[PDB]
Every structure is written in C-alpha cells, then in structure tokens.
Amino acid sequence: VIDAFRLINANMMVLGHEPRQTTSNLGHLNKPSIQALIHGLNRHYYSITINYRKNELEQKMLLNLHKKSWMEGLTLQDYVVKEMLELAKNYNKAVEEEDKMTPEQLAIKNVGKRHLEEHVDVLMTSNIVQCLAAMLDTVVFK
Amino acid sequence: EFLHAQEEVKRIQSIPLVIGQFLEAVDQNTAIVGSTTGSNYYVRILSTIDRELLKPNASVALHKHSNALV
Amino acid sequence: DDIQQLLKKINELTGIKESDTGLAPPALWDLAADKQTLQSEQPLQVAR
Amino acid sequence: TKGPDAASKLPLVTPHTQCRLKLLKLERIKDYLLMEEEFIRNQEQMKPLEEKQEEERSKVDDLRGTPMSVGTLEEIIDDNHAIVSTSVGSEHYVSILSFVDKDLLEPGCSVLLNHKVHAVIGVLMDDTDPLVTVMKVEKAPQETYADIGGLDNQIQEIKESVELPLTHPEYYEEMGIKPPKGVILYGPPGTGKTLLAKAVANQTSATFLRVVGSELIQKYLGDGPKLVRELFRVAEEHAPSIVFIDEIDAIGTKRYDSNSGGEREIQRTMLELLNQLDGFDSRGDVKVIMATNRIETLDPALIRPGRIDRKIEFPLPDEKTKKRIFQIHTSRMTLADDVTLDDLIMAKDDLSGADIKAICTEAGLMALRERRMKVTNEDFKKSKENVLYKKQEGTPEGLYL
Amino acid sequence: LNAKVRLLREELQLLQEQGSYVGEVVRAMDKKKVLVKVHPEGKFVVDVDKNIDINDVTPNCRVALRNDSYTLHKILPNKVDPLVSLMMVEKVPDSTYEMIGG
Ligand SMILES: Nc1ncnc2c1ncn2[C@@H]1O[C@H](COP(=O)(O)OP(=O)(O)OP(=O)(O)O)[C@@H](O)[C@H]1O
C-alpha cells in the first residue's frame, strides 16, 4: 500500500504541471491512476513513480530462505503420509462417486438447444507421491 | 500464472472479516448487505460463493475494506 | 388510449423544475466571493 | 403561497356513446397534446445560446462541493459565523458566504453546508416531511357532481361551506359573516360520503389534502402530533385549500381515561389536532372536511362550533333518491325495454347506493352468464336476491305489534 | 481458452473497490441533484452520475450511492423489509383444482 507524493507550488500553475517527455513511463505512471481520496485531495500534489531497487544478492538470499525457512523445503526431513492418506482417499473417492451423478444426468439430457468436477488432479498427485515414497522407503535408507 | 491468480483469489477471503447481515441480491456478483454497524452497503460477491445459500437473509462476513461478500 | 400516452409523455417532457436557489445576485459577491472567501476557505477553520 | 391540482383533461366527452363526435372530440385532444410535445421537443432545439456557453454557475459549482450536508441554523452572527448543528448535534460556529443570498436566515429552518469545511452552502432547503408531501394530489378522479344524484340538500350544504366562499365573498363581505370552516359527514356505511368527497375534489379550485384517520400512529413515543402540526402548517402555506379526513373515528373517541394504563397516547394526537383546529392564534384560510360512519362515538370536545361548523347526515335513499341513483348507474349500460327500475325500487327498502352499484354489476354479470349482452328484468330479479342475502335481522316481532 | 480464464481472474480484481452505500432518495430536483437520507446518518444533497437520467429518480427509491464522491451509482428495487416475506408468491401449492370436492 506504500506510495510516494510530492507537492506542487501554486506559483507556476500557469506553466504545465509536470512536463512529460516519455510516453511509456508516463503511461505506466498513469496506470496506478489516482485514488478516490487521492482526487479528494490530489491538488497541490503529484505522485511520483516508485520501484523496488534492483536486488540480486538480497534476492538470492531470500530465495534460499524460502526453500528451507518460509516453506517446507528442509530437504532432509522433507519426506500421516501413510496414516491419514487412506482416509483422505476415502473421502475423495466417496465425493467423486457422488459427483458422478451430475455428469450422468447431463449426458442423459438430450440436445435441448455440473459435470466439470476435476477432483482427479488432487488424487493423482497425492497418491503418486505416496507411491513414489517407496523410493525413499526401499533404497535411500538401508 | 493462472494458478497464482487462483490462489490469490482464495487468499482474498482468508483475511479477518467483519460479520454482518446480507440484505438481498440485485444481480449475480452484486448485492446489498447490512453490517453489524447498521449501515447498508452495495457490494459484490465472489464467483465462488453459491447462490441458494446467499438468497436467505442468514449471516455473512464481509471484507473489512472492500466489504465484498466472501 | 393515445390521449393518455400523449399526456404521460408530455408530463415527462415538461421538465420545468429547476428549483435551483440559494445564490446571491451578482452585486454583492462582486467584491465578495472572488478570492478572500476561497483564500480563507482552506485556512479559516471550524470550531465546535 | 402555492397552487393546486392540474388534472381536468377536457371534461366534455358529452355524447357518452359510440358516436363520431367523440371520435372527433378526442382526436382534437390528441392534436393539441402532440403539438405541445413537439412544442417542447424543438423549444430547446431553437436558439443554441445554451445559457451563453455558461457563466456565474461555475462559481456556485466550485465553491460548494458535490455533497451538501444539512443542519439547523442556530443563533446568527453578523460576521457570517452563525451556529449550525449537524444531525448528531455537531454544533459548529462556521462562516457562511459564497454567491449566497443572506436574507432567509431564521432559527430552526434547515440550512445546507459543506461536507468538509462545514461552510454554509446557500440553498436554504425548502422541503417538509415526505410523509405529507406524498399526500398532496393533483389528479381529479372522476366527474364532479353529475355522477352523484339525489343529495340536493347535502350537496347544497357542502357547496355553501366550501365552493361558494372561494367563488364570491361579496355576500359574506357585505354581511360580515365568516364562512363555516369544519364539516363532518356521517351516516350508514356506503351512503356515499367518499363519493361526495371525490366529487368536490374534482371541482376544487384549491389544492386538495387527503388523509386517512389511522395515519397518525407513529411508532415512536411523541413525534406523532408533530406530524399533524406540520401537516396543517403545510396546508396553510399552499394557498387556500381543503383538508379531508376519512374515518375520523380512529384518533378521537370519547376521550376516555387510560384505564388499563397502556398509554395509547393517541389521545395526545387528538388533543394536539383539536388545538391546531381551534385554539389560540388563528387557523387562517383552510377548510376542513371529516367523514365517519359513527359520529356519536366521537368525543364532544372535537365536535363543536368553531371546529365542525356543520354536521351533515347521509340517509338511505327512500324512493326518489333511490331511483335517481339507480337509473344514473344503469345509464352507461345497455338495458332492455321490459326492465322496470321503479318496480325493484318500490319492492325493496333500506337500500344504499353501494348496493345499487353492486346489484347493477351483478345483473350485468348474470346476463353475461346467460350469454346475452342485453339484460332483462329477470336478470335484476335474480341479482337483487343474490346480493341481498348477507343481511339477516329482525327479532320475533312478527306478532305482538 | 486459458488466456481467457486468466483474463477473467484478473478482472476479478474489481473486488478491491469498496462498495457504495445505500440511500433512499427523499427527493430529486432538477439540475442533476437529489437529496437523499442514508440510514446511518442524516440526509444530505448529492449530484447524480451520467449512467441514469434524473427523471428515473422518484421519491422513495433506494439508490446505490457512490462511497467516495457521493455521486449516484444505481437504483435498486424491493424497498420492503419484512412484507416480502408475506408475499410468498413462490412455492406454488398443489394443482388441487381437479381434486376439489363437489
Ligand atoms: N347516491 C349515490 N349516487 C351515486 N353513487 C353512489 C351513491 N351512493 C353510493 N354511491 C357509490 O357507491 C359507493 C359506496 O359508498 P362509499 O364507498 O362512498 O362509502 P361511505 O361509507 O359513504 O364512504 P367511505 O367508504 O369513505 O366510508 C360511493 O362511494 C359511490 O361511488
């Protein structure tokens, strides 16, 4: 929500406010446009374009921070996973079985001038990962 | 990018909200809702929310700034 | 029926309202409403 | 001051039948309304000079923000810093000058100010409670008197009370008599009090005021009588006019004690209404009409000279008034020669105009039931039996008397 | 297809804008102005937008009113608080016409 403002004197208002000599940057500046309250008090002011300073070392350090710290990427404890999986798959199987009625009716209906349910990518990923865990189970250890 | 947009939309509703009473529905994606502060606002509803549950007065949480039905 | 239709459309098309009042004739704001008013408009505050 | 009703769209359709005159009459009326439409369609089209491409107005637009708050103008200070309070009692002594006429300054009159700087905007708003402005009506329902028939005495009385005063006061002026102000119409239900009210409403040169008796039961304690006081103020403001109160036996009834202690408080409304009607000060030039089914139940304090100068009874038409109403109603419908209205009139007693309307309508309906557009006496013979069945009275006073 | 889906998700960004208040138009005058009474706070006078013509505004309508600039947004129906509950036109009962008695 941060923003940057700068005031304009009332002496040169006869002269142009902000002499513009670049279309791309002026349009980018206008893209934020002006806020409701901003117009309510936009006068004697003219917002100035802001941007995050180039960031590589800090960017790289943060990126390394995320994997291990800001989300689960310890990579050594990275791999319930066999306890609750049965129950999660039970829920989703029952739900998909139920949802299968709506496509049935949809097909039943003629030309006549909620089948899209997906629910399969989730199962795919979850149980394929669980099966892959065999790789850790049988080789990575012992 | 599509996935990022989807997760952003889902997050939109996670922020602490303000309880209030929905008044009525004008048209899809729009409605009138009365807050616990008593004022009545003209706001929008996310495509995710499902109509039959919205139709009855019932109770609903609004975005503390946008006031949109969530 | 066309008589009633014409009556309704002409009652719509009258538009002789303009209940716009409150202003003073341009003989007093001549030296008044010109600068000081708006020159104090922001500075001259309000006390409860 | 103000003006009244603006309906009356040529009440001269006098063939009243399928004749080429009414084809010629109404097409003349179509011609003048299309042209008056075309007169305002091109009126603005001519003279492009749209307020001299604009001037002065810009100042009022810029000085006053888009939203204008309102408040009560309190004690005035010559330096333009008159005290004003918002709706929440936000009293603020604040300046008040723009291109704004500073002559309509009074304590207690609504004033407009700026949202942000609270400076007085200008347009001292001139409006009242919308609960009353809605009551104002300018559309005469139907014909004035021709429809009504037989009440020569009652129509004469009401005319003398209302119409004659605002037509020729020469007699009143020379003789010094003030015309009567209050009139209370009473009688058995359906006698047509409402009919006569509409009748006068159709030929009232002044603005008409309409109110139902059970309209001053404002939920909040107090308030209420303020409603009626403001109503009378409004009516007085808008030039001479007549205030009509239907079913008055809902706000004043015998003024009996609270008894159970519920404090209905309607008594307070009645007392304030009575005060406004006649107490201290002067009413002004405003006429009052009251209609009710039961009058005795009204408390005496409301009903007395200076408040209801006339009490007009509306009795059941016996024969002549009955015949008048009967054939007046039947006129606008095709009827057969064999029909004998006088026969039915004599045959039945204790019959009111509402019943005449109902019986004629039912006879027409029965005839349509038979698939005959034309009616017959037998149609009325069946209709008067069907309609007059709900009424069953008479104690066993069939032998002793 | 999925560029379209992305565009729709982006356009869902309009949810950021705060909603407008609701006010019953006490009375609309000429010159593009109407005095309205919002429920929480006393009445005031506002200017109308360009979407809706003045004549459409009549006393006692619920206008959706801009939150920031106090400019007219829209008009809304159904100014009936509990009585619509008694309207109960929906939920038609059985077609008992045939099975009525003699
Ligand atoms: N003598 C008559 N001549 C013509 N029409 C009549 C006559 N008597 C009654 N009517 C019609 O029948 C209607 C029935 O009576 P009305 O509805 O006026 O009842 P009321 O009790 O006199 O008045 P209110 O309805 O205000 O209590 C009249 O309003 C009028 O339209």
Coordinates of N, CA and C and ligand atoms in Angstrom, one line a residue, chain D residues 147-149 189-195 246-247 293 325 329 353-354, ligand 1:
Chain D
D147 N -72.4 12.4 -11.7 CA -72.4 11.1 -11.2 C -73.3 10.9 -9.9
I148 N -73.0 11.8 -8.9 CA -73.8 11.8 -7.7 C -75.2 12.3 -8.1
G149 N -76.2 11.7 -7.4 CA -77.5 12.2 -7.6 C -78.4 12.0 -6.4
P189 N -72.8 3.1 6.5 CA -71.7 2.9 5.5 C -72.2 2.8 4.1
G190 N -71.5 3.2 3.2 CA -71.8 3.1 1.8 C -72.8 4.2 1.3
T191 N -73.3 5.0 2.1 CA -74.2 6.1 1.7 C -73.6 7.0 0.6
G192 N -72.2 7.0 0.6 CA -71.5 7.7 -0.4 C -70.7 8.9 0.0
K193 N -70.4 9.0 1.3 CA -69.6 10.2 1.8 C -68.3 10.3 1.0
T194 N -67.7 9.1 0.8 CA -66.5 9.1 -0.1 C -66.8 9.6 -1.5
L195 N -68.0 9.2 -2.0 CA -68.4 9.7 -3.3 C -68.4 11.2 -3.4
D246 N -60.7 11.1 6.3 CA -61.6 10.0 6.3 C -61.5 9.1 7.5
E247 N -62.6 8.5 7.9 CA -62.7 7.6 9.1 C -62.0 8.3 10.3
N293 N -68.3 6.8 9.9 CA -69.6 6.0 10.0 C -70.3 6.2 11.2
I325 N -80.3 7.4 -8.2 CA -79.0 6.6 -8.2 C -79.2 5.4 -9.1
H329 N -76.8 5.0 -12.5 CA -75.9 3.9 -12.7 C -76.2 3.1 -13.9
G353 N -76.6 3.3 -1.9 CA -76.0 3.4 -3.2 C -75.0 2.3 -3.6
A354 N -74.1 2.0 -2.6 CA -73.2 0.9 -2.8 C -73.9 -0.3 -3.3
Ligands
LIG1 N1 -76.5 8.1 -4.2 C1 -75.4 7.7 -4.9 N2 -75.2 8.1 -6.2 C2 -74.1 7.7 -6.8 N3 -73.2 6.8 -6.4 C3 -73.4 6.4 -5.2 C4 -74.5 6.8 -4.4 N4 -74.4 6.2 -3.1 C5 -73.3 5.5 -3.2 N5 -72.7 5.6 -4.4 C6 -71.4 4.9 -4.8 O1 -71.2 3.8 -4.1 C7 -70.1 4.0 -3.2 C8 -70.3 3.3 -1.9 O2 -70.3 4.3 -0.8 P1 -68.8 4.8 -0.3 O3 -67.8 3.9 -0.8 O4 -68.7 6.2 -0.6 O5 -69.0 4.6 1.3 P2 -69.1 5.6 2.5 O6 -69.2 4.8 3.8 O7 -70.2 6.6 2.2 O8 -67.7 6.3 2.5 P3 -66.3 5.6 3.0 O9 -66.1 4.5 2.0 O10 -65.3 6.7 2.9 O11 -66.6 5.2 4.4 C9 -69.9 5.5 -3.2 O12 -68.6 5.9 -2.9 C10 -70.2 5.8 -4.6 O13 -69.2 5.5 -5.5

